[PDB]
Paper text:
To test whether the presence of a proline residue at the end of the KIF1A neck-linker affects its structure and KIF1A processivity we created a KIF1A variant by replacing the conserved proline residue with leucine (P364L). This substitution mirrors the residue found at the corresponding position in human KIF5B (L335) and in other kinesins. We then assessed the velocity and run-length of this variant and determined its two-heads-bound structure. Interestingly, the P364L mutation did not affect the motor’s velocity. However, it resulted in a modest but significant reduction in run length (from a median length of 14.6 µm to 10.2 µm), highlighting the crucial role of the proline residue in KIF1A’s superprocessivity. The structural analysis of the P364L mutant revealed a neck-linker length similar to that of the wild-type (WT). Nonetheless, replacing the proline likely increases conformational entropy in the substitution zone. Subtle variations in the neck-linker path and the orientation of the trailing motor domain are visible in the mutant. Such structural deviations hint at diminished interhead-tension in the P364L mutant, allowing a part of the trailing motor domain to shift slightly backward. Furthermore, our mutagenesis studies indicate that altering KIF1A’s neck-linker —by substituting the proline at the end of the neck-linker with the equivalent residue in kinesin-1— markedly reduces the motor’s run length.
Numbering used by the authors:
A (entry chain B): 1 to 432
B (entry chain K): 4 to 389
C (entry chain E): 1 to 451
D (entry chain A): 152 to 440
Write the structure that this text describes.
C-alpha cells in the first residue's frame, strides 16, 4: 500500500484543494456526507490512498488545512464538501501574514507550525506505508508561500526518505494581483529548489489562455482554473489507485524525470479539452490526444516549449488502448520534433497506461514536461526582483520582521545558479 | 597555481593478508603503475604524479616514505605558501580503508604524527621563533564535520542542533554560528584537536574497524600583524589553512552495511560522486580552455549539488592553492577502485587556481599611491625635473 | 474577528462620522434605535458583525466609536438627533470653549484634562475588543481641535499601543477655497505628527469633491452632507474586505504592505469611480473597463492635483459587486498600455487587486445611483507634493511678518516650533522629489567579460 | 538476487531465462540502458540459457502476419506463451524424437559464455490467411529463417548461424524434416560456421498446438519453433551499449542509483563486462585457417 498525506496552505491552495477533493470524491463515488455510493468495485480497492475509514463505514480525506485567516476556513466549511473533512485538522490562526513572506515564515507562522506538524505527525504515524506528501499553495502570496516553505523544510527534516510533491502557482508577466510578488516568489523558489523532489509549476495566465482559446469560456472564473489543476492532480496519481497494463509510481516518475537533483521543476498539461459543442466534430483517439498533448498552447506554465529543449517528458494515459499505438506515437513525436529534445538522452519520453479512465470520458491523459524553457519564468522574476532590490522598494516591511539583505542576496544568487544550470543544455552541438 | 597531486600506497592489513596477499602497485620516481591481475598479459598502465609515496615496508630504508618525509614534502611548502598569505588547502581521497585518516590524522600516541599535528608543530615553532616587538601573530581554529548533508561542530560542547550554511556575497559560502575558538599554546590546540576527533562519528565495518562515517574539515586562520605605529598596520596579513578528511567510497556487498550503515554509505557515495563530478569539471574545464587557447564560455560546475562541494567552493577553485593526497590499497581485490581513484587523481592535476594573497585594499591602495608618489618624486628629482 | 476602532475629532470628523455610521447601519440592517429586526425575522446570522458593532445580551448593538470635540453644540446635536440611542451615553465633550483655530490651544492648554478621559474609553473599547485590527482617525487640517488634539491623541496612542495600524482620514486646505485665516499655520504645525505617528493618511480636498458633485452628480449647490456621504462611501469600500466574503480579500496590513514603499511616503490619494446620478445611470454600461479607466482620470481625483505631473509609485484597486478577474486583468493591461500614466521604473508590478461580492448600498434620500459594480482606488504618487508646495507658499506669506503669532505663543508655543515644522515639511517634500527620480541611469559600466 | 541465490543453493539444475530486451527505438522508460547493462552479470554468470524477445519484432509480426493493426501486451504474452509451450512440450507428450532440457541445452551452447539464442515461431497466421496456404513442413521450415519473422530486431544475414534446434509439433514425419533441412543447407544466404558441420538438432512431438479461446492464432495441424544460436545478437547488444555511453558521459540519472547503496564504479565494470561478451561473439565467428 502507498498512501499520500495532503496539505493545503493559503487561499489559493485551499481553493484548489477543495476542488481537488470534490474531483477525487466524485471519482471514487464518495458522497458529500462521507458514505460510499459507487458502482464499480475498483473504487474501494485503493480508497486508503487518499482516505481513512471511520467507524460508520464513512471515509474522511487525509487532508490538513492550514491558513492564518479564518475567512478561508469558514468558506471551505460553508461549502458543498465542508463536512467531509475532519474538524480537528482545521489548523488556523489570526492576523494573517498580509502578503509578507517574513511574517509567514518567521514571525506568525513559527507559532502555528508546531500545531500543523503535530497534526501531520499524528496523521502520518497512522499510515501503513507512507509514500509522500503533496502541498498546494501560491508562491506570490503571503501566509501560503512562507508557511508552505517552512512546512516543507520541517517535514523534509522529519521524513527524508519519502517523496515530496508541490503544486505551485507562481506570478505571471501580465496578470499581477499583489505588488510584492517578486520578493515572495524569489524566497519561495529558494526554499523550494533547496528542499523538494518534485514541483509542478502552474500559472494563471496559461490557464486563462486555455480557458479563452481551447475551452471557449466567455467568463472563466477561479473555479475553472481549480478544475484544470484538479484534473492534472488526479492524472498524476491515477496509477497508484487503479490497475493498468504498465504501472507508474510517483517515485518512478521522480527517477525518470529528474536527471540532476536541482532540476525538478515541471510543466503540467492535460488532454482532451474540447469546449463543448465540438465533441461531435472531433474524433477521440490516441493520435488526437498526443497532438493536443505536445501543442504549445496546452501547457499550464506559460512557457513556449519551442524556446528550449525537452530534458524529459512523461505521458500518463487512462483508458483502454493499444501499447503499439502509444509507443509509435511517442516515437513519431520524438522523430518529427528532433530539434526540441536533448541528443544525449535517447528516448527521453516516459509512458504509463491505466485501464480506468475518468467517469465521463472514454480516454484521457496527462503530461509532465521538463524543458529548459522554464528558465524564462525564473529570469523574469529575477529581473523584477532586481528592479525593487536596487532601490529597496518595499524592503523595510521584511527587515522589521527579522530579515537582512544577505538573505535576499543569497536567494537571488541561488536563482541565478538555477537559471544557469537550466541554460547549460539549451544550445545544440556537444560531444561524441 | 595548479593543484598539486600526491599519491601514497599503504601496506597490507588483516583482511588482505588473510586472503590473497599479492601486491599490484609498482612505484618509481614520479610514476605509479597499477597492473591488472585478471589481465596480466596487458600493458602495465602507469600514471605520472608529482609526488609518490611507498609506505609498504616500514623498517626498511628502500624508498620508504615515513610521515616525517611526507610532511616535509607537502605540508612544509604548503605551510610556506600560507606564510606568504595564500589560502592553502589539503584534501584526502581514495576508497575506504585506504589510509586517509592515517595520512591526515595518524596516531597521536606515537612519533608517526599525521599532517595536521606536524603542521601545528611547525606553525607554533615558527611563530614562537619569529616573534618580535613589531611582528606579532594570532591563530584561531575551528573543526567541523558533514555527517549526512548536515554540518556539525566538534570543538563545541554537546549541541544536538545542526549549523546553518550561508553565503556571504563577497566571501562566498561559510557556516553560521560555528564555535570557532582561539589558541595560545600547542597543548591547547592539541586538546581541541583530541576533542574534535573524539566527537567524530565512527562506526565499524568489514573493510575498516574504525571507519569514518562523515567528512571533516580542520580550519585554521592565521593573522600576521605589524605593531609599528610609524608606518605599518595591524592584521597586515591573513591566511586560511583548510585540511580536509573525506570519507571513502563503499560497496554494499563488500562492506556488509545494513540499515543505518547502508544509508550513511549511500549518502557518502552521493557526496563523493558529486565531488568527482566537480573535480572532472574543474580539470575538464581547464583542459578544454588551454587545449585550444580561449573563447569565453566558463559553463557551470554543479557546486550546489552537495554541501561538501558548496562549502569547499573557494578551495576547489579560485582564491586558494590546493593539494590532493590519494591513498591506495595495494591488494588486488581493490584494483578497480584503486584505478578509479588514480583516474580521478589524474584529473585533479589539470585544475588551475586563481590565487591572490589578500592584503587590505582599504590601506594597500593608500600604501600603493604613496609608493607611486615616492617613485615619481625620486625619478623627477634624480633627473633634475622636480 | 477583524475589529477596528473609529475615532472622530473635531466638527468635520463628527459630521463625517454621522454620515459613515448612517451608512454602516443601513449596510448591516441595524435600525437607529440600535436593535436588529433582521435577525428576529430570519432567526440568526453573523450580520451583526464585530468589525464596527459590539453586541450585548439584549440584542442591542453599539458602535465601536469615540466621538470627541470641544464644542458642546456639534455632538449635542447628535445626543438629541435620530441616532441618540445608537451610541453609548458617554460622548466626551468638554463643557468649555473651543480651541479657536489654534493648534497651541488645542494641544497644550485645553487639550489637557480631556485626553485622559478620552484615552480611558479608547481602552475600555480595546480591552473589550479582541484581535484588534486598527484605528481609523477622522479629523480635518486647519482646525484647532482638529489639529492639536488629534496630534496629542496620536502621540499617546503611539506610546501606548504602538504596533497597531492607524489609518488617518483628513481634509486638507484647498488651493483657492478656505474658511479661516490661520489654516496654513495649523496644517503645517500638525505635519510632524501626521508624518511621524500615522501609518497611512488618506487626504481629501473640498474643491475636488465640489467639482465631482457639480459635474458627475449634476448637483449645482452641494453641501457638507454630500461630501460626507462620498467620504463615507470611500471608507465603506475600504473596510468592506474584512466584513464580507470575496474572491480576493484585502486586510489593512496588506494596504500598509502594498501602498507604503518607504516609511515617510505614506500619503496616498483616493478616488471612487461610479459617481453618477440616477438620470445618467442609464445610457451607460458601467463595465469593469469603464470604471477602471474613470479611476485614473485627472478630473475624478478627490484632491486638486494632476497625476500627469508625477509618477505613480503604487496603486490598489478594491472592487465591489459583480466583478470577475478576467475584466480587472484586462483593464489593468489596458491601463498599462497607456502613455499618459507613468509608473516608476523600480515598481514593475505596480498594482494591488481586491474583489468583494457585496455591492454598494444606497442611502435613502441620497444622490448616488444604484449600481451593480463599483471600485475604490488608492494611489500613492508623487503629485501630492505639488499640493504641499502650494500650502508651503502660503505659510511663508504669513510667517515673514509674524502675523497671528501672538495668539499661538500665548498658549505655550514658540517660534522654534514653527521653524521646525517648516523644515520638516521641506524635508518631506525633498524626499518625495528624490524618490520619484528614476533609478540610476542603467549602471551599464560595460565591463568586458572578466574584470 | 534470486538468480545468485539459486545458483548458490541448487547449482546443478538448469536455469532458463525468458526476458524482454530493450528495443532499438521504442521504450517506456529513460533509464532502461542502465538496468539492462547492469543485468549483464546476472544473465552471463548464473543463467545457463537466456532467451531474449524484442517488443518491436513481435509488433511487426502481429501487424504483418496476424493483420492486427493495434496489438497490445495480451498478444505478445500469448505468443511468448506459445514459444514456451513449444519448448516444454517434449517433457509432457509422447513423440517420435523427444528433446529433454539437458540435451536441449547441450546442443545449443557450444561454449559457456555464448548461451543467448534467438527464438522464432513459424505458423503465425490469422484465420483468414490460414486458408489458401498449405502450411506444409517445408513452408514453415523456410519461414523460420526469414529475417522478417525473427523475434528480435537483428538481421541473421549480418552474422553466422552457430547452432540451431527445430522442435516440431503435430502431424510431422521425419522425412519432410530431413528434406527441409537439406533444402536449407542448400541455400547460401544462410551461413553456418565451419566448425559445426552438423548444425541442426531435430525434435518431434505428436501433440498439436492448442488455440486459446478469443485468441488470434488460427488452428494449424503442424507447427515448429526454431531456437538458433547465432552471432547476429552481438549487434543487438551493441546498439544498447551505445545508448549507455551517451547517458554515462555526463553521469545523468546516477544520483538516484548511488543514493541506494550502489557504487559509481559498478557502471564501468558492467560496461567492461558487456564489452567482453561482445568481443567473444566477435572472436567465435572468425572461421579457422
Ligand atoms: C459531452 C461530454 O461528454 O461532456 C463532457 C464535456 O463536454 C467536456 C467538454 C468536459 C467538460 O468540462 C468543462 O466544461 C470544463 C470547464 C472548465 C475546466 C475543465 C473542464 C465537463 O464539464 C466535464 C465532465 O468531465 C468529467 O466528468 C471528468 O470525469 C472530470 N470530472 C470533473 O472534473 C468533475 C466535475 C464535477 C465534479 C467532480 C469532478 C475529471 C477529469 C479528470 C480527472 C477526474 C475527473 C464531462 C464528462 C463533460 C462536461 C460535464 C460538460 C471537459 O472536461 C473534462 C476534463 O472532462 C472540458 O474538455 C473536456 C472534454 C469534454 O468533451
Ligand atoms: N467635508 C467636510 N468638511 C468640513 C465639514 N465641517 C467642517 N469641515 C472642514 O473643517 C475646516 C475647519 O476646521 P474644523 O475641523 O471644522 O474645526 P473644528 O473641528 O470645529 O475645530 P475648532 O476649529 O477648534 O473649533 C473647514 O476648512 C472645512 O472644510 C464637513 O461637514 N464636511
Ligand atoms: N602505512 C600504514 N602503516 C600502518 N597502519 C596503516 C598504514 N596506513 C594505514 N594504516 C591503518 O589502516 C587503518 C585504516 O586507515 P584509516 O586512515 O583510518 O582509513 P580511512 O582513511 O579513515 N578510510 P575511512 O573508513 O573512510 O575513514 C588504520 O587503522 C590505520 O592505522
Ligand atoms: N487559480 C487560482 N488562483 C488563486 C485563487 N485565489 C487566489 N489565487 C492566486 O493567489 C495569489 C494571491 O495569493 P494568496 O492566496 O492571497 O496568498 P495567501 O494570503 O498567503 O494565501 C494571486 O496571485 C491569485 O492569482 C483561486 O481560487 N484559484
Ligand atoms: Mg578517514
Ligand atoms: Mg470646533
Amino acid at each position: 500500500m502507498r498512501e499520500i498525506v495532503h496539505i493545503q496552505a493559503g487561499q489559493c491552495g485551499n481553493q484548489i484543494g477543495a476542488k481537488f477533493w470534490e474531483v477525487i470524491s466524485d471519482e471514487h463515488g464518495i458522497d458529500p456526507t462521507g458514505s460510499y455510493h459507487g458502482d464499480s468495485d475498483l473504487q474501494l480497492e485503493r480508497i486508503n490512498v487518499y482516505y481513512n475509514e471511520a467507524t460508520g463505514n464513512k471515509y474522511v480525506p487525509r487532508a490538513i488545512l492550514v491558513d492564518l485567516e479564518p475567512g478561508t476556513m469558514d468558506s471551505v466549511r460553508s461549502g458543498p464538501f465542508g463536512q467531509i473533512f475532519r474538524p480537528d485538522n482545521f489548523v488556523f490562526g489570526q492576523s494573517g501574514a498580509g502578503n509578507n513572506w517574513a511574517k509567514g515564515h518567521y514571525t506568525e507562522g513559527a507559532e502555528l507550525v508546531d500545531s500543523v506538524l503535530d497534526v501531520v505527525r499524528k496523521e502520518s504515524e497512522s499510515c501503513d506505508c507512507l509514500q509522500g506528501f503533496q502541498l498546494t499553495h501560491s508562491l506570490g502570496g503571503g501566509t501560503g508561500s512562507g508557511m508552505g516553505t517552512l512546512l516543507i523544510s520541517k517535514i523534509r527534516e522529519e521524513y527524508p526518505d519519502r517523496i515530496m510533491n508541490t503544486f505551485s502557482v507562481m506570478p505571471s508577466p501580465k496578470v499581477s494581483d499583489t505588488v510584492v510578488e517578486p520578493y515572495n516568489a524569489t524566497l519561495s523558489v529558494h526554499q523550494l529548489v533547496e528542499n523538494t523532489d518534485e514541483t509542478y509549476c502552474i500559472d494563471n495566465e496559461a490557464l486563462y489562455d486555455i480557458c479563452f482559446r481551447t475551452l471557449k469560456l466567455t467568463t472563466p472564473t477561479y473555479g475553472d482554473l481549480n478544475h484544470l489543476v484538479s484534473a492534472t492532480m488526479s492524472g498524476v496519481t491515477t496509477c497508484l489507485r487503479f490497475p493498468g497494463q504498465l504501472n507508474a509510481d510517483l517515485r518512478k516518475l521522480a527517477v525518470n524525470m529528474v536527471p540532476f537533483p536541482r532540476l525538478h521543476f515541471f510543466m503540467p498539461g492535460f488532454a482532451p479539452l474540447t469546449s463543448r459543442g465540438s465533441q461531435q466534430y472531433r474524433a477521440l483517439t490516441v493520435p488526437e490526444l498526443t497532438q493536443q498533448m505536445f501543442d504549445s498552447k496546452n501547457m499550464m506554465a506559460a512557457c513556449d516549449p519551442r524556446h528550449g529543449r525537452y530534458l524529459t517528458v512523461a505521458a500518463i494515459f487512462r483508458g483502454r488502448m493499444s501499447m503499439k499505438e502509444v509507443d509509435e506515437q511517442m516515437l513519431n513525436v520524438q522523430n518529427k520534433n528532433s530539434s526540441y529534445f536533448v541528443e544525449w538522452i535517447p528516448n527521453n519520453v516516459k509512458t504509463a497506461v491505466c485501464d480506468i479512465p475518468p467517469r465521463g470520458l472514454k480516454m484521457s491523459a496527462t503530461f509532465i514536461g521538463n524543458s529548459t524553457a522554464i528558465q524564462e519564468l525564473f529570469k523574469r522574476i529575477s529581473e523584477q526582483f532586481t528592479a525593487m532590490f536596487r532601490r529597496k522598494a518595499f524592503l523595510h516591511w521584511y527587515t522589521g520582521e527579522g530579515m537582512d539583505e544577505m538573505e535576499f542576496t543569497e536567494a537571488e544568487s541561488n536563482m541565478n545558479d538555477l537559471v544557469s544550470e537550466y541554460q547549460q543544455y539549451q544550445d545544440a552541438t556537444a560531444d561524441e | 597555481a595548479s593543484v598539486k597531486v600526491a599519491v601514497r600506497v599503504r601496506p597490507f592489513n588483516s583482511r588482505e593478508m588473510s586472503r590473497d596477499s599479492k601486491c599490484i602497485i609498482q612505484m618509481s620516481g614520479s610514476t605509479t603503475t597499477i597492473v591488472n591481475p585478471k589481465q596480466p598479459k596487458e600493458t602495465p598502465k602507469s600514471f605520472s604524479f608529482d609526488y609518490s609515496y611507498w609506505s609498504h615496508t616500514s623498517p626498511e630504508d628502500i624508498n620508504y616514505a615515513s610521515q616525517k618525509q611526507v610532511y616535509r614534502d607537502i605540508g612544509e611548502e604548503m605551510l610556506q605558501h600560507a606564510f606568504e598569505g595564500y589560502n592553502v588547502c589539503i584534501f584526502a581521497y581514495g576508497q575506504t580503508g585506504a589510509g586517509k585518516s592515517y595520512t591526515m590524522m595518524g596516531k597521536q600516541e606515537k612519533d608517526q604524527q599525521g599532517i595536521i599535528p606536524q603542521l601545528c608543530e611547525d606553525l607554533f615553532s615558527r611563530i614562537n621563533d619569529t616573534t618580535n616587538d613589531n611582528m606579532s601573530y594570532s591563530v584561531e581554529v575551528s573543526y567541523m564535520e558533514i555527517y549526512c548533508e548536515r554540518v556539525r561542530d566538534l570543538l563545541n560542547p554537546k549541541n544536538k542542533g545542526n549549523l546553518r550554511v550561508r553565503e556571504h556575497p563577497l566571501l562566498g559560502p561559510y557556516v553560521e554560528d560555528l564555535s570557532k575558538l582561539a589558541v595560545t599554546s600547542y597543548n591547547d590546540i592539541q586538546d581541541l584537536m583530541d576533542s574534535g576527533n573524539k566527537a567524530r562519528t565512527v562506526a565499524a565495518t568489514n573493510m575498516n574497524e574504525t571507519s569514518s562515517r562523515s567528512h571533516a574539515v580542520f580550519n585554521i586562520i592565521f593573522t600576521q600583524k605589524r605593531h609599528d605605529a610609524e608606518t605599518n598596520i595591524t592584521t597586515e596579513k591573513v591566511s586560511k589553512i583548510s585540511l580536509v578528511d573525506l570519507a571513502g567510497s563503499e560497496r554494499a556487498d563488500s562492506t556488509g552495511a545494513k540499515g543505518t550503515r547502508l544509508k550513511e554509505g549511500a549518502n557518502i557515495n552521493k557526496s563523493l560522486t558529486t565531488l568527482g563530478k566537480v573535480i572532472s569539471a574543474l580539470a575538464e574545464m581547464d583542459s578544454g580552455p588551454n587545449k585550444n587557447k580561449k573563447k569565453k564560455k566558463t559553463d557551470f560546475i554543479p557546486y550546489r549539488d552537495s554541501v561538501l562541494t558548496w562549502l569547499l567552493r573557494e578551495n576547489l577553485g579560485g582564491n586558494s592553492r590546493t593539494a590532493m593526497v590519494a591513498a591506495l590499497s595495494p591488494a588486488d581485490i581493490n584494483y578497480d577502485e584503486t584505478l578509479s581513484t588514480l583516474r580521478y587523481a589524474d584529473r585533479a592535476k589539470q585544475i588551475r587556481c586563481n590565487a591572490v594573497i589578500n592584503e587590505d585594499l582599504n590601506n594597500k591602495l593608500i600604501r600603493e599611491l604613496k609608493d607611486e608618489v615616492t617613485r615619481l618624486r625620486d625619478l623627477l628629482y634624480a633627473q633634475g625635473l622636480g | 474577528m477583524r475589529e477596528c476602532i473609529s475615532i472622530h475629532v473635531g466638527q468635520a470628523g463628527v459630521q463625517i462620522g454621522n454620515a459613515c455610521w448612517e451608512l454602516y447601519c443601513l449596510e448591516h440592517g441595524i435600525q437607529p434605535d440600535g436593535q436588529m429586526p433582521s435577525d428576529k425575522t430570519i432567526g440568526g446570522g453573523d450580520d451583526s458583525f464585530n468589525t464596527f458593532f459590539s453586541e450585548t445580551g439584549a440584542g442591542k448593538h453599539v458602535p465601536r466609536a469615540v466621538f470627541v470635540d470641544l464644542e458642546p453644540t456639534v455632538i449635542d446635536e447628535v445626543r438629541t438627533g435620530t441616532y441618540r440611542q445608537l451610541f453609548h451615553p458617554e460622548q466626551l465633550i468638554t463643557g468649555k470653549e473651543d480651541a479657536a483655530n489654534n493648534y497651541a490651544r488645542g494641544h497644550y492648554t485645553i487639550g489637557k484634562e480631556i485626553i485622559d478621559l478620552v484615552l480611558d474609553r479608547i481602552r475600555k473599547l480595546a480591552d473589550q475588543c479582541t484581535g484588534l485590527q486598527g484605528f481609523l482617525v477622522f479629523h480635518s487640517f486647519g482646525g484647532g481641535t482638529g489639529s492639536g488634539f488629534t496630534s496629542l491623541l496620536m502621540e499617546r496612542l503611539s506610546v501606548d499601543y504602538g504596533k497597531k495600524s492607524k489609518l488617518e482620514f483628513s481634509i486638507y486646505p484647498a488651493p483657492q477655497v478656505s474658511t479661516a485665516v490661520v489654516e496654513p499655520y495649523n496644517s503645517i504645525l500638525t505635519t510632524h505628527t501626521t508624518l511621524e505617528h500615522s501609518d497611512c493618511a488618506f487626504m481629501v480636498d473640498n474643491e475636488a469633491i465640489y467639482d465631482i458633485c457639480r459635474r458627475n452628480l449634476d448637483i449645482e449647490r452641494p453641501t457638507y452632507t454630500n461630501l460626507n456621504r462620498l467620504i463615507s462611501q470611500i471608507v465603506s469600500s475600504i473596510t468592506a474586505s474584512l466584513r464580507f466574503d470575496g474572491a480576493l480579500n484585502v486586510d489593512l496590513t496588506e494596504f500598509q504592505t502594498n501602498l507604503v514603499p518607504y516609511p515617510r511616503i505614506h500619503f496616498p490619494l483616493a478616488t471612487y469611480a461610479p459617481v453618477i446620478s440616477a438620470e445618467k445611470a442609464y445610457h451607460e454600461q458601467l463595465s469593469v473597463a469603464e470604471i477602471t479607466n474613470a479611476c485614473f482620470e485627472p478630473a475624478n481625483q478627490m484632491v486638486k492635483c494632476d497625476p500627469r505631473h508625477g509618477k505613480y509609485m503604487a496603486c490598489c484597486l478594491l472592487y465591489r459587486g459583480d466583478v470577475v478577474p478576467k475584466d480587472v486583468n484586462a483593464a489593468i493591461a489596458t491601463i498599462k498600455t497607456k502613455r499618459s500614466i507613468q509608473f516608476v521604473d523600480w515598481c514593475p508590478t505596480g498594482f494591488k487587486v481586491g474583489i468583494n461580492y457585496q455591492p454598494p448600498t444606497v442611502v435613502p434620500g441620497g444622490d448616488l445611483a444604484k449600481v451593480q459594480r463599483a471600485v475604490c482606488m488608492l494611489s500613492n504618487t508623487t503629485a501630492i507634493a505639488e499640493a504641499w508646495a502650494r500650502l508651503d507658499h502660503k505659510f511663508d506669506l504669513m510667517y515673514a511678518k509674524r502675523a497671528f503669532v501672538h495668539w499661538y505663543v500665548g498658549e505655550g508655543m514658540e517660534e522654534g516650533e514653527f521653524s521646525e515644522a517648516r523644515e520638516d515639511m521641506a524635508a518631506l517634500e525633498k524626499d518625495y522629489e528624490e524618490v520619484g527620480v528614476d533609478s540610476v541611469e542603467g549602471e551599464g559600466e560595460e565591463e568586458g567579460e572578466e574584470y
